[PDB]
Amino acid sequence: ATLKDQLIYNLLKEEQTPQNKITVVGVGAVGMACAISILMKDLADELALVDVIEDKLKGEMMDLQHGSLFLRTPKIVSGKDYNVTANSKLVIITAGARLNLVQRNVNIFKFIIPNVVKYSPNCKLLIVSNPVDILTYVAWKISGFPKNRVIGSGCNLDSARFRYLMGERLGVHPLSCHGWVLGEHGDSSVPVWSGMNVAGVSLKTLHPDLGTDKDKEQWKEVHKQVVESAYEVIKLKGYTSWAIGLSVADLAESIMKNLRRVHPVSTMIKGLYGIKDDVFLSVPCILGQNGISDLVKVTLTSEEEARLKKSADTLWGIQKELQF
């Protein structure tokens, strides 16, 4: 007659599978920022963590667990073995180590993806690890999931940084500053000037020289600052964490709560802008409980299409040379 048995009468031991489980793969600075943002948004009833460094993994798990009083996620687990990830709705891959980088990371996915698939055959994959557009393709390929269930973080953070910088210029909350950065994540991303607006007032229409060499106000600087800010953050603190974690949590929210909000994420663009290769790039997608159910067909200028087409060529050039 334990104290537990004296205190509590059990009606059923009928344990059941977690209903809204999320797994993060890789407990580096990016993965843990994703984890804490996810925990604080009450998106999962069970959170699983996986990594190859066993000590760091257990220690992060316990540190999260010790915050359980202040959370609404009743079960947090971790392990190197992927059985802990079983029955995840969403699995978020951040594992890496900050063309060498590709095959290096391709070998890693060859282990991770099949294990993820093994234990959550019907999950959505959200790839954050870089190069994210290539690695989203790699995951799509290895897992054999339909295109809707393999999502890259893509230009989600790029766009968010853009909207912050735009809001600073205008003196307006980023929520009310709209603008899309599409295509290849990072250096070669495309700011779609035609979609930039506040309250439906297109900045292109008011300012027809927007984002061109002529522009007297040099709004191209804003997109340049998006990439410059990324290098400056790494220069200053060594890594990026908070912003990517907050943006991934926002994607997870749409997926887990089947919101059908639209986000700039990396999806297979074969069939658009004259691209015929099996490659992934960022366009606005509708996110929900089976991942990317729909995408928005943004009208690009000839110069913008050309930039996406060049990225798709560069990326297929790397991908045809890959060993699976």
Place this chain on the structure above:
Amino acid sequence: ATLKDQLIYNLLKEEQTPQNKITVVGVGAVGMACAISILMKDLADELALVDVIEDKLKGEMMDLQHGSLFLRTPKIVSGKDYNVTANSKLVIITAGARQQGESRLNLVQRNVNIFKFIIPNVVKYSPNCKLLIVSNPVDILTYVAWKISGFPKNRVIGSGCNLDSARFRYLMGERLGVHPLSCHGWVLGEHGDSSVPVWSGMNVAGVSLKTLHPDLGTDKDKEQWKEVHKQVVESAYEVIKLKGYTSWAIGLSVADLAESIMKNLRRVHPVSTMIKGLYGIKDDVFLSVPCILGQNGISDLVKVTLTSEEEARLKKSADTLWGIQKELQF
């Protein structure tokens, strides 16, 4: 005109003084976990960050700012200068660099020295703020914050046993298969190794565990519930061994205190306060008891009936702390 002027007509450019500003001093692992938890709880309309390492400081600020789309804290600032902290309602001190293997005395003297410059700068720019001390040793450093600031007792709060208690309830919830929220239990006194678990208060739904199980908390306990408090101490060392530091649990616990304070909730939390006049304690020491927290900081405290042995452990901590504190120079 410029594009901004063509787009937006300005009605006025007046005023602009923060209504719910929080400052965090020290942007290490603890500081930044406090910052992100505070931001995701929509507690502040402005967050200020302060450190001595200028590069790190600026990059941490930027990193938070780039997540602005996903938050409702419209202004994040940072700087080595305390002018960025002006008009803070709450100022959280997580500065000092964590202990290696170094001792308490070495930690004490280095962090006392750090506070001698931090605290007056905080007081200058935010004379009416509540101060929340997290840096270790927390009970001593809360005293130090109080002595230097000249603040009344209600506005100097030490994180104290708030994390100890959170871990205790976590562990208690594990053994019982109940959410920590519904497992009640208080760890009081000196933060860390010497903390006191108050067995008589441990309950679920108002049912005293001690009443059900009289051996609870004793050596004669066949179920060794006394290990639950031991594991609170053990789990802390273990986390530090495994990942090198602690961040998430302390950050979450601190954001909870900040919530009570900023929203004037008058919830009861176990935090360190100036305890002179209780438990036959006569010296100026800060220890954790259950404190009502709100917009004036600690407005009231709960008088917990302690056992002879629990009273003795607190008095012992008070004697030891004061022994250190009398030999400090200001």
Place this chain on the structure above:
Amino acid sequence: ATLKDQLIYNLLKEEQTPQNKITVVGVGAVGMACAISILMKDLADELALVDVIEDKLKGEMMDLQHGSLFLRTPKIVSGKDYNVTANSKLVIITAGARLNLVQRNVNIFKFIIPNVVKYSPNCKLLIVSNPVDILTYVAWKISGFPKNRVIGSGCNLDSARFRYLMGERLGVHPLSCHGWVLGEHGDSSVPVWSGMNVAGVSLKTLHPDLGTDKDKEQWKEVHKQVVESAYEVIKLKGYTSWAIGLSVADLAESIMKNLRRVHPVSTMIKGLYGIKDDVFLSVPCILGQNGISDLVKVTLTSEEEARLKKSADTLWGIQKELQF
């Protein structure tokens, strides 16, 4: 091609079922208060409303729908026909008359409960309609559900009001004021004085007269004022809504997110306190994804135990005369 097909490319069209659906039966003052609170707590991805008054029902649905921009519940439906309630995790019954009260609400349930079960066989039932302890038994009896999946709102509001009044006297937030009102909802509930505490400090130990007539401070009136308050709110306002909505939403949060928090709700207490009859009364219960998995065995004084057994006799006396 339509504008939609011009703007949006579909990957997959097949309609997925809701992951976290809740139904509210009865769109009166209580039902809609439950709904708004549930909606502002982000507990459901689908909300279904049912009533017999078709106009009021449609209008209430539309009114919620028109607030969709400010919510995170992407689908809101209504109907007199229970097919709109299909696949609910949780079904909350607030339909009824605001002995005669019993028989006529029993006749309503003979139609409601089978229809609920038909379309959501694995749902948790949460009963709010009065008299709640009797009607919870009625719902259990008719549904054929196991007892863990039939939950009466019970003493959850009574305890919430008790903690509010306690907080006012002590000048402490009700969250930090702990105290349990158990047994039969309403006039015959039992305040468990031994459990009343702040920070683990027993009020009864500090103030032995607590809950007796000898008490100079009349702490016994705190429990009486719980009952007086209910009647007073009705006199002043005509009904109660907000408090009960909020309390139901809190129960729903533990159920839907599997929190395993303890709440005072109505459950089958046969086998406890000498009770032999098939009756439902409030004890502290652990709430999660399977409804009530466990029960806290509160130590009650001789008088408290007898008060509970008395209620059980009274409730069975009524129950045995009912026609199903």
Place this chain on the structure above:
Amino acid sequence: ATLKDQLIYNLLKEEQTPQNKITVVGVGAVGMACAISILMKDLADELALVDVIEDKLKGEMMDLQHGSLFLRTPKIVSGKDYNVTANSKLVIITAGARQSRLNLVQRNVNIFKFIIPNVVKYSPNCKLLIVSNPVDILTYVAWKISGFPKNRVIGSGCNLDSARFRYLMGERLGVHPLSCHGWVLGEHGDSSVPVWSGMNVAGVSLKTLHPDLGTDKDKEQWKEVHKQVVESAYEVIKLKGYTSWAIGLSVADLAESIMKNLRRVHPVSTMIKGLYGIKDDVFLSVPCILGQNGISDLVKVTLTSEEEARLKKSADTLWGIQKELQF
């Protein structure tokens, strides 16, 4: 000693002036919906309720207070006397009672003549958020009676109109209303203007994709989406007898920008003199930046000639009513 004093030692006997206080004037269906939504969004540390029906007011206060355990707003107060409203940051006016119009007007002006001065006396530094109808006119009336600068007098205006529109838009497109952008401006209600040029998803102009958007020759008749916005309002009233939830939610959204100084852009009613050839003191909805000082800025929407003419017509009609009011 008392139980409280044996349990609790007091360090200071309080009490600060209220720091994040909101008052709601009028505890009808709309005001109580505003109240619950504000409470569930943790926007205030003190909520004050005012009305002229004593019993109802006291009963609503108690009902809310009884849910305190589940809220984070530690002080909820009410009264017919406006001393209970002292030091509010934001005062929300939903007083009047449900419906001619000029009847509703001069009737509600008589009400405002008592309400507004009382509000001003106890919170001279508050922002006013007017919800009561006709909202554009009644926002003008609160502005004039108060003597407040125009930045602190905000009308709910076309906020609800724009949210209904976005709901309808999202229903058509199979997208969440958050990702469906579109603005309904001008006079709240029957005469509101859908700005077809701003209507977009992901910055893709639906007008650019479909130049017939919002026109008569539109083969998909997207004009009906605006008509449905107005038809929706009549339908709700017919079906349930009043509107509450949606307006409450939208108002709470405005309160959040204001109390948290977010500087988000919302379609609210503001003094529009000097724009679109409007020369009178009239309040019409345009996109406004909302923060701790109310409306600090407004967005200059480029309107078609027909859009501008509709705003001008509302302005003339509104001014013609306003000029005749007795204060």
